[PDB]
Structure 1
Amino acid sequence: LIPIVVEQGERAYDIYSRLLRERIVCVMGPIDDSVASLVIAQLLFLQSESNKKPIHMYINSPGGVVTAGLAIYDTMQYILNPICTWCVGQAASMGSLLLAAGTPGMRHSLPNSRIMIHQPSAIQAEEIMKLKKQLYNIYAKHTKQSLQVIESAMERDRYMSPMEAQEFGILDKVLVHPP
């Protein structure tokens, strides 16, 4: 059960509602059209509190529906707030894409995270390759890698260390403690 915390005059929120107070948005678990709705709702709300106050996106996800992930991505690029993305636990498939789509220089990962841009395996065939050529362009955009490099990197069924993903362009800093 989700616990309750008390603020200070006095009011009490559940601890997850309290992270949204600190402009923290959690992207935990697999991604579908409901996670997309919840995340977009919180991303458009925190922009209403301030257009320039940064938002923090915690990503601990194995992937999910591609269109639902693109939906969260398109809302990320839309809003004006900078977004600090934090990779904790793992970020694979659609998860690493939201991770790599943070504001340049604010994409982080904790030391022991695992990062994967390879996509683990009904619509027609050409619509699936349409999706991948989009993911090829987004990953290239934010990593600053070429379409050649992104295509072959997504072929390798394997994970990256935080240091690997940083020197690939996925994230920017690998923190251990607050600076």
Structure 2
Amino acid sequence: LIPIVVERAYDIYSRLLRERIVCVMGPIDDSVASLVIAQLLFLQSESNKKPIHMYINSPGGVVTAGLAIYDTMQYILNPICTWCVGQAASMGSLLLAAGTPGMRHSLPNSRIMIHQPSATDIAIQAEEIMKLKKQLYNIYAKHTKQSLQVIESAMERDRYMSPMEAQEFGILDKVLVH
């Protein structure tokens, strides 16, 4: 399934990590967050000044898993370029929006969604789900430079944004074709 490339031989995913690329593809859960966090801490130890590239094609996932990734992103010193490929929905678009200012990108045909689905590691109470939702509000507000009221009304609409809308909204900075 997974091919080998190139003195030294790597599986193609290990070779992408040698380029300082971290993939966040597919639904986000604790093991994805564990793998993502492991690579971020590793790449920073190799160099805390060289940029990291986080390529995101994700429909969303566990909220606490996503915030762990978000928090690790804020922790390391490295500039992080985020790229939306295919889509970034729910927790995925939160990670996309959290890359280094000026370094958040999308491919031309991507779809971006900040609406949250209607998940949880264990079952939780209504006060807890609202507390988490407020955390998403503040993080999105921080990185889009929109106000809380703008973020809450926008997240109430069950819809995807085009890459240019997300650019205008503050989720990303540039839409590139090459």
Q: TM-score under structure 1 normalisation? A: 0.97
Question: Kindly, what percent of the aligned residue pairs are identical?
Answer: 100
Which whole-Å CA distance do the structure 2 matches of 1:124 and 1:163 have between them?
A: 37
Which whole-Å CA distance do the structure 2 matches of 1:44 and 1:100 have between them?
A: 20
How far does residue 3 in structure 1 lie from its aligned partner after superposition? 0.3
- 1:17-75 CA-to-partner distances (Å, cap 9, x unmatched) read 00000000000000000000000000000001101100000000000000000000000
Matches within 5 A, 1:115-130: 115-121=112-118, 122-130=123-131
How far does residue 153 in structure 1 lie from its aligned partner after superposition? 0.2
Which whole-Å CA distance do the structure 1 matches of 2:157 and 2:48 have between them?
A: 39
What's the RMSD between the two structures over aligned residues?
0.3
Q: TM-score under structure 2 normalisation? A: 0.97
SS of 2:22's partner is: strand
Residues 1:166 and 2:163 aligned together:
no
Which whole-Å CA distance do the structure 2 matches of 1:38 and 1:103 have between them?
A: 21
Where structure 1 has 5 or more consecutive residues not aligned to the other structure, the ranges are: none
What stretches of structure 1 move > 4 A for 4+ residues in a row? none
- 1:65-102 CA-to-partner distances (Å, cap 9, x unmatched) read 00000000000000000000000000000000000000
Aligned with 1:38 (options 17, 30, 35): 35
Which whole-Å CA distance do the structure 2 matches of 1:52 and 1:103 have between them?
A: 13
Where structure 2 has 5 or more consecutive residues not aligned to the other structure, the ranges are: none
SS of 1:167's partner is: helix
Which whole-Å CA distance do the structure 2 matches of 1:33 and 1:71 have between them?
A: 9
How far does residue 120 in structure 1 lie from its aligned partner after superposition? 1.2
The alignment covers a number of residue pairs equal to 174
Which whole-Å CA distance do the structure 2 matches of 1:164 and 1:175 have between them?
A: 14
SS of 2:151's partner is: helix
Which whole-Å CA distance do the structure 2 matches of 1:51 and 1:157 have between them?
A: 38
- 1:88-118 CA-to-partner distances (Å, cap 9, x unmatched) read 0000000000000000000000000000000
Matched with 2:5 is 5
Matched with 2:46 is 49
Which whole-Å CA distance do the structure 2 matches of 1:82 and 1:138 have between them?
A: 18
Which whole-Å CA distance do the structure 2 matches of 1:145 and 1:52 have between them?
A: 29
